[PDB]
């Protein structure tokens, strides 16, 4: 599988029993107590680039982590999970600042009281792909992918006043089909196109509808299945019309029926459950890969297709058999356990606590993390690789150059962004901006040996001068 992608995750943040803390100060403490280079904006809040190529910054009232650019869904999982470890460590380091605040961080999307915050997916696409096709084919996919993507939520309605359990935290906050908004009146398809790359070649698709996932299987399926659907859209492969009546109403109705029986009404007359509509996308993705690649299909594409199909078959048979793989199922398994053990209504405060603490980043207190510790969740990557990904960038995108420069020449990096690194060299009145405009250049194959041989940032900038259209574009 090969498509440039990344995940940005806004974390919930709590500072109990500090009546004079505010979310902005607490979020700044998290970012500043971890780290590094400043973000190149060309207030300016706490806002840094890490040696793994990631962004760590304050986005209004939340600390946010953005993965380096990666090329496949396994690597997206790996560097996204590294973000959870970075957040947990940053909060631990903040406790040692003079202020002494105990800061709790949650990889979720709502306070169950009407506020939502985002876990965004980003995908690089051909600029030539007509946007009407992106909209028409992605809306029904996004309405239904929560059957395996959802993180689960206790409470129905944006304000949480309705009693019950639903598949997704985000669904109640989406109100329109297409638009620019990310904080209110949220659209199923967000239309911002800011690729940090050559806009004559590339569109960046900015997806905002997904829940943050703890489960690595869920994150893998979310990014990997979406990437397969994007490949079909780019190639004009989908001849069917999957459009549904009232897609915003359908998104919420699908979320509000965890029995998975609610039927969408397609414009072509069909009545399909969300699982059934997902199986239609899966069948097309299988035909597409067979038609295009035949035996040239790579193992990861094969693995995504197999896990997608297996998950959908098990969801239609008995969703509770997926309690080791999907967040909403694992969470529901705990929730129903307490409901049976203690005869609790869906309005019980203990059930709200389980819903939130599932996403706590602490290894010793977060409920997902306790499930992993007791061997009750399937993993996709191993912890040693996650730890390495906290500090080292992917090898096959421009994040390699960005992260390796920061590790080796950190003192002489004035700032960095997705599309440049700014050097401050000893004895120069001017900053040296090295553009990194192509996401698939600046990789280890391009600059790795050069970086190895260079002993100072002055030597590197010298070796790169006039070679921009070789190493980076």
């Amino acid at each position: 599988m090969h498509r440039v992608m990344g995940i940005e995750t806004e974390y919930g943040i709590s500072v109990p029993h500090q009546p004079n803390a505010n979310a902005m100060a607490a979020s700044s403490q998290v970012v500043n107590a971890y780290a590094q280079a400043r973000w190149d904006f060309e207030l300016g809040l706490a806002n840094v680039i890490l040696t793994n190529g990631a962004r760590l910054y304050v986005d209004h009232a939340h600390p946010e982590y953005s993965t380096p650019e990666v090329t496949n869904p396994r690597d997206a999982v790996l560097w996204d999970k590294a973000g959870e470890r970075i957040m947990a460590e940053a909060a631990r380091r903040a406790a040692d600042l003079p202020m002494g605040w105990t800061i709790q961080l949650y990889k979720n999307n709502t306070d169950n009281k009407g506020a939502s915050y985002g876990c965004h997916e980003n995908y690089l696409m051909n600029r030539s792909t007509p946007f009407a096709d992106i909209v028409r084919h992605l809306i029904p996919f996004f309405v239904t992918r929560q059957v395996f993507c959802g993180a689960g939520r206790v409470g129905i309605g944006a304000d949480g006043r309705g009693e019950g359990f639903q598949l997704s935290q985000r669904a109640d906050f989406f109100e329109v089909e297409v638009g620019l908004e990310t904080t209110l009146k949220r659209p199923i398809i967000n239309t911002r196109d800011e690729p940090h790359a050559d806009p004559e070649k590339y569109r960046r698709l900015h997806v905002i509808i997904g829940d943050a996932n703890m489960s690595e299987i869920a994150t893998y399926l979310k990014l990997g299945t979406t990437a397969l659907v994007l490949a079909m859209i780019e190639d004009g492969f989908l001849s069917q019309d999957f459009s549904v009546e009232s897609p915003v109403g359908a998104l919420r109705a699908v979320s509000h029926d965890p029995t998975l029986r609610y039927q969408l009404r397609l414009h072509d007359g069909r009545r399909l459950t969300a699982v059934q509509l997902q199986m239609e996308y899966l069948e097309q993705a299988r035909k597409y890969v067979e038609d295009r690649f035949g035996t040239d299909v790579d193992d990861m594409t094969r693995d995504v297709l197999d896990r997608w199909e297996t998950t959908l078959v098990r969801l239609a048979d008995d969703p509770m058999q997926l309690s080791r793989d999907l967040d909403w199922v694992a969470k529901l398994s705990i929730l129903e356990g307490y409901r049976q053990r203690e005869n609790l209504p869906w309005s019980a405060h203990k059930l709200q606590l389980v819903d939130l603490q599932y996403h706590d980043v602490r290894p010793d207190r977060g409920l997902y993390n306790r499930l992993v510790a007791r061997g009750r969740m399937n993993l996709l990557v191993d912890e040693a690789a996650v730890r390495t990904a906290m500090h080292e960038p992917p090898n096959d995108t421009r994040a390699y150059f960005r992260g390796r420069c920061l590790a080796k020449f950190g003192a002489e990096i004035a700032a960095a962004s997705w599309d440049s690194v700014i050097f401050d060299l000893p004895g120069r009145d001017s900053l040296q901006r090295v553009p990194t405009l192509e996401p698939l250049r600046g990789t280890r194959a391009h600059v790795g040996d050069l970086l190895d041989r260079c002993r100072s940032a002055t030597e590197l900038v010298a070796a790169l001068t006039g070679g921009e259209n070789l190493y980076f574009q």
Partner: peptide
């Protein structure tokens, strides 16, 4: 159930107070 005992061991104290106090600013 065994895992429900492990969850019981780590749940936040004062569950109602904790849930009512979990109030977030809107994000994206």
């Amino acid at each position: 159930d065994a895992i429900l005992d492990e969850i019981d061991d780590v749940l936040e104290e004062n569950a109602e107070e904790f849930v009512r106090s979990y109030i977030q600013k809107g994000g994206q």
